[PDB]
Design a binder for this molecule. Structure first.
Ligand code: SF4
Ligand code: SF4
Ligand code: FES
Ligand SMILES: [Zn+2]
Lengths: 126, 114, 208, 688, 95, 48, 82
């Protein structure tokens, strides 16, 4: 009711109990995941995935597994806008990198363009 | 940006509540080190307590400082009861080195640590 | 769709629609959404200042009894200015209907301790405080239940990872149980599984 | 004006004319289940899965070739649309075998995803299921043609972007074997791209064939190496290691494209790597030891030596971060000499002047060029993705492309002008009808290869090409800003070293003899222990060294491009950082970490410890290199060419030929590609 | 049935034998490395190549719906005998 | 099971090696995997 | 000791940077004829403070800000460096 409020940023790493080593050490990455190109389906777009950097993964000497001393290794954070993505990355204290979304460029194709008269565009095989 | 407070009006009442909390922690140590049959002198534990208070020293929002006061209040109630045990109080200490320094040469002999 | 398809009660659809329109018209101060699911349970989406008034209304008023309290949950959703969702669930004894009171909340600004109107909400509030951090002012006892007291971090966030930061073992050096940083002997192989190709065209959110 | 209305499911939107239904559905957010369409190829209405019902129509039309007439109402989710999709999917799963366990596209099929989300569930067709005899298309591509659904996608692929025409349809009815009738190895560049074009598990990878499965592996952002272009590459990594790589899309460059060497190049990256620092022993044997003895020996020698005897050759795939750190320690001690494997002339201020030493235009912007000539190179075997862009340009709009130096197998009916620099300058300057095409054309491009840069006359040929570009620049009033002129390179770290103010070429070592030198990835024989005094003290910091490494005195295990967060520059000046995917085997720490540790141990220091502070000093040296992902267009071309008149020397009549000319010379020119036995298999396959 | 290390240890069907600079050998000390005695590759070459004079054949592998699913393999190449990807056992046509 | 015991497959034991934990002859775990990264071979010849 | 390297930081729009563009139109070929031995270099990124730096004497770097300055003043700063 028009109360106390100050206008400042947020530093939630004092609250969430995380080690400051894993705060100042690592660095987030915010990106739209590129389409797995062997498939052709663009539903895997329309997100904003936040990952962390990959780190040390040695081998289990007894079996031949993959062991790591990395607690923040296998997270991913699905967001829906870059604005609140960068806002959250600022808000929870860690540093971050911002890649940029690259759309499929629209084109101009026709079967009639494939079957021209003098133009060298000619499929010659179908 | 009318945002609700928790308890205080600025950082000053927050300083008052946290110095009350620090007084309670300071006169709350010797009963704990007498009760739990511990292993460490009184002044060393008090120094790590005041070091923990020194750790969060760059917080300016009143809600966050009030919430840390609430966290310390909850932990102080649990330590002044006998709900916690020897393992938790030793878990506040960090004696299980891991002596891993910030020396770039020592960061180089055991590495991959940006 | 005559075999193998779950039928739905359109009678209950119309009744819950009329009742939700009733509640929304009679409390205009706090009601923001009333939605009816296709499987017919009522949902009421609520600003976090009518917690105590709407719960005093819903426990009483005798057109809607709703004594039975089910869960209070908090679901952690990023990409929102107000992240968390306090979800009351109410059940009427005389009427056999269920309403989901979804009031929203942020990280820091509290809500106001439903134990003054609902005694069953006590330990639910204590649990949701210990696991998330939605502060509960005007409440008698906010302590830690379902964690260790040396443990902290509110681990039911999406920000907290799967495996915690600490890990216990015993050592004869200090003759006790110690807590070291986490050392997994196996990766927890995470599987990217979400295929493309739009499994539900009715739920297509619009593009930018 | 240029806008046509459709009611896609009753939702109105304006559409450009000439486009078709599927582009409108992707404009509104819809998809359509499709097989034979592809967004880089021609449209051939064969798959029949793409159907959609339009109102007031007795048939159901295909959504690939139908032009958008005015005021449609498109029912993407009507009744008979779903009925037709169920029918066509039930047709497709009759002649397709039960290989879903043993196939190579388990999570990455397309039949499986479309058969769930659009197909039926109860099947028919009790008896039948024809079988097709497989072929051996090549030792790089495993081929089981029974999984082929005859979707006719690789054929249009080859016939447009490869131009090779070795894959055709044979037969009729149910019996249509798609392949080569004569059992000839389909081998060319970009042949590795066909295993991702194949939307089913029919044309697949040979070295990857039965090693993984897509849901276990995790994807990782990365940037291509070994080429000056840098296609955007996603490494399918698994278990602290790899499995394989895939191309991914940048708008300006390499949209769904990758080199075949690049695709199959990870084996030599994992084959015989270096693990530990190695010091010689007085028997004469390069033993291995801990970092203490090696770094102490190197620091003691470096502190005990100064002068012009401190040399550093950085060739091959090295960072920009490591170059900044090495240059900074280098100027901490006394002075300089730095060289690369390749040579660039410094006459008209070539080390500076952002104009000349890189590709000035846009690689996507070569589509708007009109007349292009090409002085000695072979773009089929120097960044083949650029050749694919050239062929795509020539296929869509008009080009006139001439080649100077050697008639090679560029596959698009090119002009050839002969082999002499005097021929190029005199013919293109004085009087010739093709030179008249240059003067009275509109948007021309002269591409200078880095292959003819290697001779001593490179300043003269550079001066002649700059004279041609300057003459067209003074001609026609076109377009500024735009330009005829561009050059290409072979290694990205060459472009980075030209950016950071180094001396290209070994000439500073040829004149002044050094007595202490650092080899960062010198593969070829630029310098040896015979072009240098006997007491050498060379330190090779590298990975899987087999040629260059037995020469060495001190071996340092440097990291690899999949093992460190680099910052690389393409041939047109775009900073693209890599992402760490694999931690290296052995000790094998990071390169700038090694150099700053060397500054720590030897009697000096550096005011930076982390990679962000390395980026701060990189921001100090060059401002564009930290502003990622963007182009940078410089100017002052006439100023560069009037600087070029300082040295005006002979254009000798030796017939310039690109050594980048044949398949083995493509496959073997790296330590990485030289190491991998996959490349050895396909070398002996193509030769024998 | 097997082969043997130079140190005198049972190798496997997979070539994963050891150095003299290892420690998995020292955890093998005193406790028997239980290799599979019977290998897998050896049994296939002992099998008679089943020959049917058809063109395109079926395969089940030891009982209907007890084994790998039906695979229809081609027998049109002659010097290249068609191998089931599941069974492993070859086939030849006759004429 | 003397009505029909057998199976006509030639791999089945007749010893039926029983439970053996706590013996000198017991199972050990290991890796059924060959060489991982194939370390670089240093040459044997000297340069002086 | 002596001079080693000179670096130029420019953009497309700033008035002092426009003065440095005029300096680099008129007095760079004169500057290159002055010393063919000094590797001066010119850089733009997209937009930046138009700096002029010089590294010499075992790595000592010196800054001048050529913001809102004319071309003759940039010539004076070049004489200050050299
Ligand atoms: S081989 Fe693959 S891409 Fe070619 S027609 Fe068959 S299914 Fe299509
Ligand atoms: S291509 Fe697809 S449908 Fe065919 S066997 Fe492979 S995974 Fe199955
Ligand atoms: S895309 Fe229209 S037929 Fe395949
Ligand atoms: Zn079989």
């Amino acid at each position: 009711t028009q109360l106390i409020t100050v206008d400042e940023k947020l530093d939630i790493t004092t609250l969430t109990g995380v080690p400051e080593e894993h705060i100042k050490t690592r660095k987030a990455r915010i990106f739209v995941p590129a389409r797995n190109n062997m498939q052709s389906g663009v539903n895997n777009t329309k997100k904003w995935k936040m990952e962390f950097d990959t780190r040390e993964r040695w081998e289990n000497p007894l079996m031949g597994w993959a062991s790591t001393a990395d607690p923040l290794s296998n997270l991913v954070l699905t967001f829906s806008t870059k604005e609140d993505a960068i806002a959250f990355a600022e808000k929870n204290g860690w540093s971050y990198d911002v890649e940029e979304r690259k759309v499929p460029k629209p084109k101009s194709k026709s079967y009639g363009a494939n079957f021209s008269w003098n133009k060298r565009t000619r499929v010659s095989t179908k | 940006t009318s945002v609700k407070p928790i308890f205080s009006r600025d950082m000053n009442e927050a300083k008052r509540r946290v110095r009350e909390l620090y007084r309670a922690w300071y006169r709350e140590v010797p009963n704990t080190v007498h009760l739990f049959q511990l292993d460490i002198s009184v002044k060393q534990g008090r120094d790590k307590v005041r070091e923990m208070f020194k750790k969060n020293a760059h917080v300016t929002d009143p809600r966050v400082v009030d919430l840390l006061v609430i966290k310390g209040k909850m932990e102080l109630e649990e330590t002044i009861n006998v709900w916690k045990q020897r393992t938790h109080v030793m878990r506040f200490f960090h004696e299980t080195e891991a002596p891993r320094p910030k020396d770039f040469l020592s960061k180089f002999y055991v590495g991959h640590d940006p | 769709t005559r075999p193998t398809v779950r039928p739905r009660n359109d009678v209950a659809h119309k009744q819950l629609s009329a009742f939700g329109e009733y509640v929304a018209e009679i409390l205009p101060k706090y009601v923001q959404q009333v939605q009816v699911s296709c499987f017919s349970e009522l949902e009421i989406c609520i600003h976090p200042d009518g917690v105590i008034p709407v719960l005093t209304f819903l426990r009483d008023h005798s057109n809607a009894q709703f004594k039975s309290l089910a869960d209070l949950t908090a679901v952690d959703i990023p990409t929102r200015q107000n992240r968390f969702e306090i979800v009351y669930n109410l059940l009427s004894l005389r009427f056999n209907s269920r309403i989901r009171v979804k009031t929203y909340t942020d990280e820091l600004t509290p809500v106001e301790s439903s134990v003054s109107v609902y005694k069953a909400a006590n330990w639910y509030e204590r649990e949701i405080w210990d696991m998330f951090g939605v502060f509960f002012a005007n409440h008698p006892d906010l302590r830690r239940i379902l964690t260790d007291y040396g443990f902290e971090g509110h681990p039911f966030r999406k920000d907290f990872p799967l495996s915690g930061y600490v890990e216990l073992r015993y050592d004869d050096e200090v003759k006790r149980v110690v807590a070291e940083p986490v050392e997994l002997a196996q990766e927890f192989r995470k599987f990217d599984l979400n295929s493309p190709w739009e499994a539900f065209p009715a739920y297509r959110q619009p593009p930018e | 004006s240029n806008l046509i209305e459709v009611f896609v499911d009753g939702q109105s939107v304006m559409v450009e004319p000439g486009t078709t239904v599927l582009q409108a559905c992707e404009k509104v957010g819809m998809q359509i289940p499709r097989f034979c369409y592809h967004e880089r190829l021609s449209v051939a209405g064969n798959c029949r899965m793409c159907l959609v019902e339009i109102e007031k129509a007795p048939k159901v039309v295909a959504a690939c070739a139908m032009p958008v007439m005015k005021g449609w109402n498109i029912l993407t989710n009507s009744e008979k649309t779903k009925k037709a999709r169920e029918g066509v999917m039930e047709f497709l799963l009759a002649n397709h075998p039960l290989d879903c366990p043993i196939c190579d596209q388990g999570g990455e099929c397309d039949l499986q995803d479309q058969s769930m989300m659009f197909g039926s569930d109860r099947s028919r067709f009790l008896e039948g299921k024809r079988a097709v005899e497989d072929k051996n298309i090549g030792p790089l591509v495993k081929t089981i043609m029974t999984r082929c659904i005859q979707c006719t996608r690789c054929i249009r692929f080859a016939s447009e972007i490869a131009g090779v025409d070795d894959l055709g349809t044979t037969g009729r009815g149910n019996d249509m074997q798609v392949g080569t009738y004569i059992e000839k190895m389909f081998m060319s560049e970009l042949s590795g791209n066909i295993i991702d074009i194949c939307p089913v598990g029919a044309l697949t990878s040979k070295p990857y064939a039965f090693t993984a499965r897509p849901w276990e592996t995790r994807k990782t952002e990365s940037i291509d190496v070994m080429d000056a272009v840098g296609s955007n590459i996603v490494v399918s990594t698994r278990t602290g290691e790899v499995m394989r790589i895939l191309p991914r899309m940048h708008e300006d460059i390499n949209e769904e494209w990758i080199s075949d060497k690049t695709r199959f190049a990870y084996d030599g990256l994992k084959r015989q790597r270096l693990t530990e620092p190695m010091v010689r022993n007085e028997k004469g044997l390069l033993t291995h030891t801990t970092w203490e003895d090696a770094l102490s020996r190197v620091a003691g020698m470096l502190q005990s030596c100064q002068g012009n005897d401190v040399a550093a050759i950085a060739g091959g795939l090295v960072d920009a971060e490591a170059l900044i750190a090495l240059k900074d320690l280098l100027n901490r001690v006394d002075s300089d000499t730095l060289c690369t494997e390749e040579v660039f002339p410094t006459a008209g201020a070539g080390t500076d002047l952002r104009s000349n030493y890189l590709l000035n235009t846009t690689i996507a912007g070569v589509e708007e060029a009109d007349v292009v000539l090409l002085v000695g190179t072979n773009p089929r075997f120097e960044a083949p993705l650029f050749n694919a862009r050239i062929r795509k340009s020539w296929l869509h709009n008009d080009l006139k492309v001439a080649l100077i130096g050697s008639p090679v197998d560029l596959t698009y009916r090119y002009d050839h002008l002969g082999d002499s620099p005097k021929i190029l300058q005199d013919i293109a300057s004085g009087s010739h009808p093709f030179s008249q095409v240059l003067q009275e054309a509109k948007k021309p491009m002269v591409v200078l290869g880095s292959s003819a840069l290697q001779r001593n006359d490179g300043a003269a040929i550079l001066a002649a090409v700059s004279n041609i570009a300057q003459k067209i620049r003074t001609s026609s009033g076109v377009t500024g800003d735009w330009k005829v002129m561009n050059i290409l390179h072979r290694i990205a770290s060459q472009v980075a070293a030209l950016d950071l103010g180094y001396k290209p070429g070994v000439e500073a070592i040829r004149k002044n003899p050094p007595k202490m030198l650092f080899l960062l990835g010198a593969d070829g024989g630029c310098v040896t222990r015979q072009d240098l005094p006997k007491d050498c003290f060379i330190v090779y910091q590298g990975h899987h060294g087999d040629v260059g490494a037995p020469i060495a005195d001190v071996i340092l295990p440097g990291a690899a491009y999949t093992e460190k967060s680099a910052t690389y520059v393409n041939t047109e000046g775009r900073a693209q950082q890599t992402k760490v995917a694999v931690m290296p085997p052995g000790l094998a720490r990071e390169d700038w970490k090694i150099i700053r540790a060397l500054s720590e141990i030897a009697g000096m220091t550096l005011p930076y410890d982390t990679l962000d502070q390395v980026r701060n000093r990189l921001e100090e040296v060059s401002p564009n290199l930290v502003r990622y992902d963007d182009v940078e267009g410089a100017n002052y071309f006439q100023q560069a060419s009037e600087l070029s008149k300082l040295v005006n020397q002979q254009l000798l009549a030796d017939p310039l030929v690109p050594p980048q000319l044949t398949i083995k010379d493509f496959y073997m020119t790296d330590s990485i590609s030289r190491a991998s036995q996959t490349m050895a298999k396909c070398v002996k396959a193509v030769t024998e | 049935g097997v082969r043997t290390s130079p140190t005198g240890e049972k190798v496997t069907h997979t070539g994963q034998v050891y150095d003299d600079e290892d420690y998995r050998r020292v955890r093998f000390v005193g406790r028997q490395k239980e290799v599979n005695e019977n290998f897998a590759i050896d049994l296939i070459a002992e099998q008679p190549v089943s020959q049917v004079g058809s063109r395109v054949i079926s395969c089940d592998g030891g009982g209907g719906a007890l084994g790998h699913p039906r695979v229809y393999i081609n027998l049109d190449k002659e010097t290249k005998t068609g191998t089931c990807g599941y069974c492993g056992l070859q086939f030849r046509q006759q004429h | 099971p003397t009505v029909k015991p057998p199976t006509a497959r030639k791999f089945i034991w007749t010893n039926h090696k029983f439970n053996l934990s706590g013996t000198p002859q017991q199972y050990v775990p290991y890796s059924t995997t060959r060489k991982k990264i194939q370390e670089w071979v240093p040459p044997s010849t000297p340069y002086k | 000791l002596g001079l080693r390297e000179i670096r130029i930081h420019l953009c497309q729009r700033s008035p002092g940077s426009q003065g440095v563009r005029d300096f680099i139109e008129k007095r760079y070929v004169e500057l290159k004829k002055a010393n063919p031995d000094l590797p001066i270099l010119i850089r733009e990124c997209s937009d930046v403070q138009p700096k002029l730096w010089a590294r010499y004497a075992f790595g000592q770097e010196k800054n001048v800000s050529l913001n809102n300055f004319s071309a003759d003043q940039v010539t004076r700063a070049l004489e200050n460096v050299l």
